[PDB]
Amino acid sequence: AHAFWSTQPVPQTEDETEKIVFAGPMDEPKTVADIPEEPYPIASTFEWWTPNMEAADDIHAIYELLRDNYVEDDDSMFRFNYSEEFLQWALCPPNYIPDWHVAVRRKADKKLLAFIAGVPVTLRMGTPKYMKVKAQEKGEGEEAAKYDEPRHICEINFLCVHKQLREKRLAPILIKEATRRVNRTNVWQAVYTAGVLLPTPYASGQYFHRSLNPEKLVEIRFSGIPAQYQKFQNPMAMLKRNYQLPSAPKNSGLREMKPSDVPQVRRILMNYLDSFDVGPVFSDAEISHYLLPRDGVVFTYVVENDKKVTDFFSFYRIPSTVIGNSNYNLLNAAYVHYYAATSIPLHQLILDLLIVAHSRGFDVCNMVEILDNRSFVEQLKFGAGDGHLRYYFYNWAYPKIKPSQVALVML
Numbered sequence: 001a002h003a004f005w006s007t008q009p010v011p012q013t014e015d016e017t018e019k020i021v022f023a024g025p026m027d028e029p030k031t032v033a034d035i036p037e038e039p040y041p042i043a044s045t046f047e048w049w050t051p052n053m054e055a056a057d058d059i060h061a062i063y064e065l066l067r068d069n070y071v072e073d074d075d076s077m078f079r080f081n082y083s084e085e086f087l088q089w090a091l092c093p094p095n096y097i098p099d100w101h102v103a104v105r106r107k108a109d110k111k112l113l114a115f116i117a118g119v120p121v122t123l124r125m126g127t128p129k130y131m132k133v134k135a136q137e138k139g140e141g142e143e144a145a146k147y148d149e150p151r152h153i154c155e156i157n158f159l160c161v162h163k164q165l166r167e168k169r170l171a172p173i174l175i176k177e178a179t180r181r182v183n184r185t186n187v188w189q190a191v192y193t194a195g196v197l198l199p200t201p202y203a204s205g206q207y208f209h210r211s212l213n214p215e216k217l218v219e220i221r222f223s224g225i226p227a228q229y230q231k232f233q234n235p236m237a238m239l240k241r242n243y244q245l246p247s248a249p250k251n252s253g254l255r256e257m258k259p260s261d262v263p264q265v266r267r268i269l270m271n272y273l274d275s276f277d278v279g280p281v282f283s284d285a286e287i288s289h290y291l292l293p294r295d296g297v298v299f300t301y302v303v304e305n306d307k308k309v310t311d312f313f314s315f316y317r318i319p320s321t322v323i324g325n326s327n328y329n330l331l332n333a334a335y336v337h338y339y340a341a342t343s344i345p346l347h348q349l350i351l352d353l354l355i356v357a358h359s360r361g362f363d364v365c366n367m368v369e370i371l372d373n374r375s376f377v378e379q380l381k382f383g384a385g386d387g388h389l390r391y392y393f394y395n396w397a398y399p400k401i402k403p404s405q406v407a408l409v410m411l
């Protein structure tokens with residue numbers, strides 16, 4: 001049923017994943033020297049290209065490919081429009097490997113036809129807590145703990161094939177060449193997410209959405225007017241009233257994050273994320289890169305009291321092109337990023353996130369039900385959406401876990 005994925009080191013069915021008890025690799029052990037030195041063969045009219053994602057025109061080329069060809073909703077009403085500044089941020093974290101950014105161009109005119117990107121991440125991906133309990137009962141604690149040390153792996157994102165080249169088996173070639181380049185760097189696992197169902201997720205979470213500009217969301221058919229609103233004479237004014245938010249944050253001591261906050265934010269974030277079965281481990285440099293504010297891209301606020309950072313939240317911007325409605329070009333979405341609360345309830349912290357996002361002109365706040373995101377859904381008027389985000393490993397057997405045991409945000 002899967003001419004490509006059946007040949008790959010991933011669990012092949014849900015029934016197989018249901019039987020996995022310990023974390024660990026799936027493929028035969030290999031070394032860098034076993035991996036082909038030469039790029040994977042591609043047809044003569046095409047060439048491999050490694051873009052320089054710190055060069056403005058290379059970023060712009062990838063930006064255009066994604067703008068016109070990346071993920072759409074199922075009704076082709078919206079398509080992600082990640083900005084050039086966002087792409088540079090997401091693709092060039094500390095110690096990133098340029099060779100892991102893989103493109104295909106038409107050799108004749110250098111037209112960009114396809115892209116896939118990998119970035120390094122340090123991930124805790126050892127056997128989850130519930131399976132360690134079973135392992136202990138069975139005398140298998142050592143094997144269950146074998147791969148507990150955080151692992152330096154690849155995170156894959158931004159797979160895209162031009163619309164005119166679809167269903168020609170180019171995606172498997174891109175994946176194969178990315179795998180080769182990552183393996184040549186002595187890295188053997190990857191983590192990736194998708195909205196679609198592939199073999200075989202270790203976790204899946206529903207998307208949730210918080211209306212910030214409901215009149216726009218209804219107009220573009222992102223949101224509907226619930227049936228119960230028809231019992232009122234003006235359902236739209238009632239809708240706006242329901243979603244209204246304060247004009248300024250409520251938490252005393254909230255301010256934008258600054259460079260000197262990096263060590264404190266690292267400590268509180270790492271203390272929080274260590275409670276989840278799967279999660280990243282961030283250095284100071286990675287905290288700085290992923291969390292310090294960048295205009296139009298990432299927004300991060302801390303709660304400071306007694307000159308100490310006790311809480312923080314972050315969100316990032318991904319607009320989507322509104323394909324079918326001529327009255328609006330873009331849907332401006334804020335996505336919940338990392339956060340940590342030690343002094344206030346999480347719903348009180350995330351209310352300030354919604355306020356800041358609304359004040360800055362965002363139309364909706366999106367998130368997946370990872371981390372403790374479910375704990376503020378009802379209080380802050382998030383609604384479940386149609387979409388899901390499925391989490392996958394390449395070359396890593398892993399038991400099924402709930403999305404609330406996942407602490408890795410994927411951009």
Ligand SMILES: CCCCCCCCCCCCCC(=O)SCCNC(=O)CCNC(=O)[C@H](O)C(C)(C)COP(=O)(O)OP(=O)(O)OC[C@H]1O[C@@H](n2cnc3c(N)ncnc32)[C@H](O)[C@@H]1OP(=O)(O)O
Pocket residue numbers: 001002003004005006069070071072154156157158159160161162165166167168169170171172175178179182183187188189190192193194195196198394395
């Ligand atoms: C150690 C290091 C390892 C590094 C790599 C780790 C693995 C990373 C894996 C990538 C993680 C990416 C994470 C994200 O970015 S998820 C976002 C994916 N991008 C989009 O949805 C953008 C719009 N769509 C496209 O650009 C294309 O339709 C794509 C590129 C998605 C498929 O192109 P096309 O439509 O022209 O099809 P084909 O004829 O070339 O190929 C068909 C084969 O492709 C399999 N397919 C379809 N969709 C996906 C998908 N989203 N992940 C993995 N495989 C997918 C499909 O099952 C079939 O295989 P099989 O069913 O026959 O077996």
Ligand SMILES: Cc1nn(C)c(C)c1N(C)S(=O)(=O)c1c(Cl)cc(CCCN2CCN3CCC[C@@H]3C2)cc1Cl
Pocket residue numbers: 071072073074078079080193194195207320331333366385386387388389410411
């Ligand atoms: C406004 C809007 N624009 N677009 C393009 C869509 C679909 C919408 N919606 C309608 S949606 O409700 O907001 C929504 C929906 Cl249905 C489904 C999904 C499934 C995940 C898609 N990918 C896969 C690759 N990447 C991994 C990490 C981020 C990214 C997520 C995501 C969303 Cl974000």
